[PDB]
Amino acid sequence: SFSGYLKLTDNVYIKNADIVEEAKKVKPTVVVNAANVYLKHGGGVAGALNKATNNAMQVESDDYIATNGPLKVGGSCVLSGHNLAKHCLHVVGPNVNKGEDIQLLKSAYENFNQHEVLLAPLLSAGIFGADPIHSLRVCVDTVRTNVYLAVFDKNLYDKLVSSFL
């Protein structure tokens, strides 16, 4: 199971870790991807997870988009987890660098409540442009299921833990 996590609340845990490396080690039932509406896994967590699947995640995603069209900002879809997890929950947090409504971050986190336990990154953090301290606050106040947060950057991890109310 998950190891080396700091408990933040009854159901939220956090660790300074590469989510690709965490997923390969634990092989969780669900790994969350920081997806965009087109499931174009170019950079950030999405690019890293996709590269770990040898592009199989992108091939599957393109077939999903061809059939279903794009996701909504705040929405999600469950696809295969490939070599990383049983499933990948592709969740679209608002991208602040695209002028997307930050209030959609709570809607994005609500998707996590459909899964008993998840390995996840902070939604809308990193290249999505939102304040990661705000993302962690929305996470703890929205997610009721067990969420194991992987924060890649050590310096951001320390800031998140030390400022956690």
Ligand SMILES: Nc1cnc2n[nH]cc2c1
């Ligand atoms: N917050 C995270 C977690 N794992 C990551 N792997 N590559 C980029 C990442 C960002």
